Write an enzyme that holds these catalytic residues in place. Structure first.
Site, PDB file in Angstrom:
ATOM      1  N   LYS B 250      26.997  38.262  36.004  1.00 50.95           N
ATOM      2  CA  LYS B 250      27.610  37.408  35.008  1.00 50.95           C
ATOM      3  C   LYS B 250      27.122  35.953  35.144  1.00 50.95           C
ATOM      4  O   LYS B 250      26.834  35.464  36.241  1.00 50.95           O
ATOM      5  CB  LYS B 250      29.142  37.462  35.124  1.00 50.95           C
ATOM      6  N   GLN B 310      34.830  47.930  46.040  1.00 53.32           N
ATOM      7  CA  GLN B 310      34.102  48.066  44.779  1.00 53.32           C
ATOM      8  C   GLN B 310      32.678  47.623  45.081  1.00 53.32           C
ATOM      9  O   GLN B 310      32.448  47.065  46.144  1.00 53.32           O
ATOM     10  CB  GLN B 310      34.722  47.213  43.681  1.00 53.32           C
ATOM     11  N   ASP B 345      29.936  43.787  35.785  1.00 56.53           N
ATOM     12  CA  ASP B 345      29.097  43.526  36.951  1.00 56.53           C
ATOM     13  C   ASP B 345      29.387  44.395  38.182  1.00 56.53           C
ATOM     14  O   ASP B 345      28.705  44.249  39.201  1.00 56.53           O
ATOM     15  CB  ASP B 345      29.133  42.020  37.346  1.00 56.53           C
ATOM     16  N   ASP B 380      41.833  43.006  47.411  1.00 56.54           N
ATOM     17  CA  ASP B 380      41.631  42.815  46.000  1.00 56.54           C
ATOM     18  C   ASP B 380      42.162  44.038  45.231  1.00 56.54           C
ATOM     19  O   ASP B 380      41.881  45.188  45.610  1.00 56.54           O
ATOM     20  CB  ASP B 380      40.111  42.611  45.798  1.00 56.54           C
ATOM     21  N   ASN B 381      42.912  43.776  44.153  1.00 52.64           N
ATOM     22  CA  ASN B 381      43.391  44.813  43.220  1.00 52.64           C
ATOM     23  C   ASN B 381      43.689  46.176  43.844  1.00 52.64           C
ATOM     24  O   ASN B 381      43.208  47.193  43.364  1.00 52.64           O
ATOM     25  CB  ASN B 381      42.394  45.000  42.061  1.00 52.64           C
ATOM     26  N   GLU B 409      46.959  42.013  46.453  1.00 49.45           N
ATOM     27  CA  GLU B 409      46.899  41.338  45.186  1.00 49.45           C
ATOM     28  C   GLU B 409      47.093  42.346  44.069  1.00 49.45           C
ATOM     29  O   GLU B 409      46.133  42.681  43.377  1.00 49.45           O
ATOM     30  CB  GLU B 409      45.572  40.607  44.999  1.00 49.45           C
ATOM     31  N   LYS B 520      34.334  30.971  39.758  1.00 49.23           N
ATOM     32  CA  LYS B 520      33.921  32.340  39.960  1.00 49.23           C
ATOM     33  C   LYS B 520      32.484  32.543  39.562  1.00 49.23           C
ATOM     34  O   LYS B 520      31.812  33.358  40.144  1.00 49.23           O
ATOM     35  CB  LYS B 520      34.836  33.285  39.157  1.00 49.23           C
ATOM     36  N   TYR B 521      32.032  31.820  38.549  1.00 42.49           N
ATOM     37  CA  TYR B 521      30.714  32.034  37.966  1.00 42.49           C
ATOM     38  C   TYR B 521      29.739  30.904  38.236  1.00 42.49           C
ATOM     39  O   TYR B 521      28.624  30.915  37.714  1.00 42.49           O
ATOM     40  CB  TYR B 521      30.841  32.205  36.464  1.00 42.49           C
TER      41      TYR B 521
HETATM   42  O1  LIG Z   1      32.466  40.364  39.982  1.00 36.39           O
HETATM   43  C1  LIG Z   1      33.502  41.270  39.544  1.00 36.39           C
HETATM   44  C2  LIG Z   1      34.622  40.615  38.747  1.00 36.39           C
HETATM   45  O2  LIG Z   1      35.337  39.754  39.645  1.00 36.39           O
HETATM   46  C3  LIG Z   1      36.365  38.890  39.090  1.00 36.39           C
HETATM   47  O3  LIG Z   1      37.581  39.602  38.842  1.00 36.39           O
HETATM   48  C4  LIG Z   1      38.336  39.706  40.027  1.00 36.39           C
HETATM   49  C5  LIG Z   1      39.383  38.575  40.186  1.00 36.39           C
HETATM   50  O4  LIG Z   1      38.884  37.292  40.640  1.00 36.39           O
HETATM   51  C6  LIG Z   1      40.297  39.003  41.309  1.00 36.39           C
HETATM   52  O5  LIG Z   1      41.236  37.979  41.547  1.00 36.39           O
HETATM   53  C7  LIG Z   1      40.992  40.273  40.888  1.00 36.39           C
HETATM   54  O6  LIG Z   1      41.564  40.081  39.589  1.00 36.39           O
HETATM   55  O7  LIG Z   1      40.000  41.290  40.865  1.00 36.39           O
HETATM   56  C8  LIG Z   1      38.910  41.094  39.961  1.00 36.39           C
HETATM   57  C9  LIG Z   1      37.803  42.115  40.360  1.00 36.39           C
HETATM   58  O8  LIG Z   1      37.455  42.001  41.760  1.00 36.39           O
HETATM   59  C10 LIG Z   1      35.891  38.120  37.843  1.00 36.39           C
HETATM   60  O9  LIG Z   1      36.922  37.219  37.307  1.00 36.39           O
HETATM   61  C11 LIG Z   1      35.323  39.110  36.847  1.00 36.39           C
HETATM   62  O10 LIG Z   1      34.936  38.321  35.697  1.00 36.39           O
HETATM   63  C12 LIG Z   1      34.135  39.849  37.533  1.00 36.39           C
HETATM   64  O11 LIG Z   1      33.498  40.764  36.655  1.00 36.39           O
END
Ligand SMILES: OC[C@H]1O[C@H](O[C@H]2[C@H](O)[C@@H](O)[C@@H](O)O[C@@H]2CO)[C@H](O)[C@@H](O)[C@@H]1O
Ligand SMILES: OC[C@H]1O[C@H](O[C@H]2[C@H](O)[C@@H](O)[C@@H](O)O[C@@H]2CO)[C@H](O)[C@@H](O)[C@@H]1O
Lengths: 649, 649
Positions: B250, B310, B345, B380-381, B409, B520-521
């Protein structure tokens, strides 16, 4: 090994004592089994209830549904069959077909990956087909597989072929279940119908005598049985039928010293003539009792004996088993109590010196009366004897004789009341007589018909010899009519104590719940024939109420009950259902003034659309009405206590 | 054997999963153990809690009291000591001395059977004496026995001699307990202090680089640590530190295609350079990481690593363990999702083809980081992987290493949230960020501090990289001040994600909870020095809050919390206590307008009489007030977000 399985299935209900005691039903009774079911990720789950009989045989396919959105709480109704010990499991599984369908309906019009999606559906449907025993049903699903895979046809068409009514029917009956996970089994004790449903009449045989012999006998008392059966009752509850002590015997109106003719209180059990396994000589002999029971049986009446584990001071146990009593240091035994009430005429039993002896004797006594056809025992003040004692006795008696029914007369705090049901009493007395306003009635019956119904079966006596409520005292005959209707329509078991029909409502004094010249302390002859011809008895209303109950399944169950709003605080409305039988009741709780109100029916809770207008018949009058969402009523005390309506099919 | 014992003790709490999983505590934490305790008849009962350590040793005499009248619900507070698996039992017993006393006080002035009553008391007191190990205490009770039996003295005098303060003291410490009955033991897992109490800071090491090398390393990122420790934090949570995939990487602001320099998202774990057991080469090597962790430790900072089960499409697992993924019929693996959010991604893991392989690898990975000083994992998740998988992993890891702490989380439905905590997650993320009004805050914290505290320990992050709430967006700096005070005073664990101090509150767009130009990006360098000198950082408030928490035991626990009424809907007041420490907080939830309100303190809930007036200090300002039953406050956004007061000793 983990505690949670592949597909979480948690907190199955009903549960009693964390699964250490059984949840309850009777034959033909329906109830909801629930659980918390969900999975990881975002795909669908499904769930079903597996009910297993005493031989371990599974019942039918019983799919569950989520009860409220976002809750993850699932439920389904099940129904108990033959009596005995059963078990229930919830199975939870992944539901990949519902999942696939959801995505397909979006992706296919969106044109996303249509070939891949359709092949994925095909492979699910194939697996679903391999499980289906029906040949026609198998053909139906393979047909859909072929269509899903037909790459010559339009995507939306191929897809529609997988979503037809007949595909749906096969899959509803035989779903593809991924990763099936089961709860540990929970126990269900299924008992006979009378445990839940029955109409009870209490009377004192000794009051039904003659001019020559005022103290009635079992042979004279038997003459009342036909009139009791004709009122639609099923059970006759007799106070203690044993000899009655002479030491500290009570006189009329609960006076301390009896005079020469005074008969005393039946609950003061025992004398040199015999104890709990004997018949009061003035009632006759054990043969006379057999005759009484036989005559009852022919009329469809079962007998419930009173069982009061306590003694007069002249009971043979006093000298034969002194260690069954607590003696003070001077040797005397303190008389029993329930403060501010004193029972100077009896001694309470002590349980901690010879528990085994007390238990053995108790079951011998009950077995004696059982051998003479008494299959129901009304247990006097069970809360003043150890809870584990009742657990052991009931378990012993039901171990050889599972039909026997025990009713707990425990007017006490909730914890004890609940525990007594949970350790095995089939029925309980309740707070009914102290619930007289709409808010009291609604709150209590909501409680009784909810979670409590997995362990407690209520017996609504509108009165007892010990309870004449102010509501009846101040209400007069119209109050008696109201309470009868309520008791009879709110619980599948109800009862009255003789004299209720005559609207006897004179208290010992202002602010007492005792009757004046109480039958407990004296013979109480009644002119039943004159009350009938003069119309001063509500015996015809009572009869009608029991007929309606016998004719309407809805009133022979507890758990399905709902309160519909009204704009009058005096006026209460509720409904009960069983299969296609639906009974609607509107009651005016004001015994002195006519009340008019609008009753607003929860139409869906009756299984109707809001705009629908269904016909009803008021079974008290025979009169027909057409009712819907909002209905005017007008109820005049003395003329009409209520509407007890059946919805016409 | 019966299910109820001689003295009923029922429904002991806390209980988790019907006793199949342990209730939770940490060292020095206090909580209430309750049960339903009663007996037959009318005599008095008593009860006590027996807490047993991992070696089975009983704790101190812990008498229970009825928690409210008529309820038969009894409770007592216990406190956890060293870590490990403990148990707790409730003992219930007859309390014949309280019973006797009740009757004696009435009968003796009544002149009823005074000699018998007094002799009975003497025999009870003698039996109580036979148990008392102390010789002085024994003398004290025998002396009362003698007085009770002295027939030459007046009744009321003899009796008074059994009711003195020093007789009472002996019996409170060593009561005569009849018919002691015990519950089955329930399990308690006691864990380390951090599991419940700690302040957390999240930041991205790659953002703390230099002009010459924008992508920061562990060696450059280590320079932020002193500042983080100086703000009073205990834990540093790092997003994933592993290599990041290139396929479907991304770009900035969650765009689909990265351009040539874009760094991508840390959660897109894995490339040919390594996976979950490797370090992103731009952060340096494993040795640089060790340096980072060592430097952290010297500052009193523990590291929490992110664990995201993941893979990027370039993770070696994709080719080495394809059966760890679900492949569609064309061989492709659908990218992970959390709709309407898409994670193009990454690939999600499949658990049903090789559960043993996945478990083995997972614990190997966690053990690797454990061997390098990481004793806390932010998972994570977790709710998108099987619940039983987490149960098995955590049980495996805590089996050898019980200090390790896992934080879930799971922003999901309550059932899953609860179940995750109950199967072993030490901490949970919560709904905090979506609780902003007084009613929301009060309701949610009531839930969190009640029965849910026996299995869940909350971590109140006021923000995360994924959550910038409208409240902060529309509130500005005064909103950041409020939420910092709330999080820090309402949960013994709270946290912020870097940039919160600077009040960064620009969203991706209207109605989004994403930050614009999200870290994040992209690398996100911050001028920490300028913010400091220009005073545009709430860092000093944050520091003060953590200091107050470090200085006040009340704020290092969860369960003791109470909401005091106010006459303003924008203004909320609450209190927390631990021993003699009491903290009182008043917050203005309105970030735009000054609010004045009267705060009406539940004085008894603070342990004061109603008319009392006790001094407080507002630890934010140092200012002293004298407060009582009703107090005027005036809170001006920007000047004062709240009053955080300690009651002065
Ligand atoms: O790179 C994978 C994915 O990661 C992020 O989403 C995360 C988020 O930060 C975490 O806090 C939780 O919600 O789990 C998600 C997946 O690990 C990005 O925000 C997302 O855009 C990206 O594709
Ligand atoms: O003879 C004892 C006692 O009997 C009555 O009280 C009963 C009551 O009628 C029962 O239903 C139950 O409550 O227990 C009590 C004793 O078993 C009389 O009312 C009482 O005066 C008499 O002493």
């Amino acid at each position: 090994p983990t505690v949670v399985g592949r597909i979480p299935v948690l907190d199955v209900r009903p549960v009693v004592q964390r699964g250490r005691r059984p949840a309850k039903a009777v034959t033909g009774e329906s109830f909801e089994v629930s659980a918390t079911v969900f999975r990881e990720g975002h795909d669908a789950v499904g769930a079903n209830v597996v009910l297993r009989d005493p031989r371990g045989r599974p019942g039918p396919w019983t799919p569950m549904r989520e009860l409220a959105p976002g809750t993850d709480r699932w439920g389904a109704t099940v129904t108990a069959g033959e009596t005995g010990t059963w078990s229930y499991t919830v199975e939870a599984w992944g539901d990949p077909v519902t999942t696939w369908r959801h995505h397909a309906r979006i992706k296919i019009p969106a044109g996303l990956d249509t070939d891949l999606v359709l092949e994925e559906g095909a492979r699910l449907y194939e697996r679903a087909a391999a499980d289906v025993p029906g040949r026609e049903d198998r053909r139906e699903l393979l047909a859909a597989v072929d269509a899903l895979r037909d790459e010559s046809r339009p995507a939306a068409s191929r897809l529609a072929a997988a979503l037809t009514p007949q595909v749906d029917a096969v899959l509803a009956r035989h779903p593809l279940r991924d990763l099936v996970t089961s709860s540990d089994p929970l126990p269900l004790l299924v008992e006979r119908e009378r445990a839940l449903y029955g109409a009870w009449y209490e009377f004192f045989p000794r009051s039904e005598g003659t001019p020559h012999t005022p103290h009635g006998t079992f042979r004279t008392a038997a003459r009342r049985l036909p009139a009791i059966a004709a009122m639609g009752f099923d059970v006759v509850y007799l106070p203690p039928i044993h000899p009655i002590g002479t030491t500290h015997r009570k006189g009329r109106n609960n006076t301390l010293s009896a005079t020469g003719d005074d008969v005393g209180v039946p609950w003061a059990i025992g004398s040199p003539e015999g104890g709990h396994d004997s018949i009061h000589p003035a009632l006759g002999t054990l043969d006379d009792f057999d005759h009484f029971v036989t005559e009852a049986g022919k009329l469809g009446l079962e007998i419930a004996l009173d069982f009061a584990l306590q003694c007069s001071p002249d009971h043979p146990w006093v000298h034969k088993h002194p260690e069954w009593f607590h003696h003070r240091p001077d040797g005397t035994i303190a008389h029993a109590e329930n403060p501010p009430k004193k029972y100077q005429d009896i001694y309470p039993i002590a349980f901690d010196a010879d528990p085994d002896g007390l238990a053995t004797e108790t079951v011998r006594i009950l077995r004696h009366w059982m051998d003479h056809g008494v299959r129901i025992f009304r247990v006097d003040n069970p809360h003043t004897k150890p809870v584990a004692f009742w657990e052991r006795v009931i378990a012993d008696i039901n171990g050889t004789d599972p039909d026997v029914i025990f009713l707990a007369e425990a007017f006490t705090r909730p914890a004890m009341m609940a525990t007594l049901a949970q350790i095995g009493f089939q029925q309980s007395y309740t707070y009914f007589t102290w619930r007289n306003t709409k808010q009291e009635l609604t709150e209590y019956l909501t409680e009784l018909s909810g979670e409590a119904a997995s362990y407690m079966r209520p017996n609504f006596f509108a009165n007892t010899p010990d309870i004449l409520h102010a509501y009846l005292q101040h209400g007069g005959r119209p109050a008696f009519e109201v309470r009868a209707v309520l008791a009879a329509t709110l619980s599948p078991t109800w009862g009255i104590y003789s004299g209720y029909e005559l609207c006897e409502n004179t208290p010992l004094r202002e602010g007492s719940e005792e009757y004046l010249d109480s039958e407990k302390y004296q013979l109480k002859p009644r002119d039943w024939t004159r009350a009938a011809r003069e119309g001063t008895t509500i015996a015809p209303l009572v009869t009608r109420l029991n007929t309606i109950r016998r004719e309407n399944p809805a009133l022979r169950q507890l758990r399905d009950l709902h309160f519909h709003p009204t704009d009058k605080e005096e006026v209460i409305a509720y409904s009960k259902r069983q299969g296609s039988n639906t009974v609607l009741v509107v009651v005016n709780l004001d015994p002195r003034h006519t009340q008019e109100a609008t009753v607003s029916l929860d139409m869906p809770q009756l299984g109707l659309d809001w705009h629908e207008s269904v016909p009803v018949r008021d079974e008290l009058t025979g009169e027909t009405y057409h009712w819907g969402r909002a209905n005017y009523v007008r109820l005049e005390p003395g003329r009409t206590p209520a509407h007890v309506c059946t919805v016409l099919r």
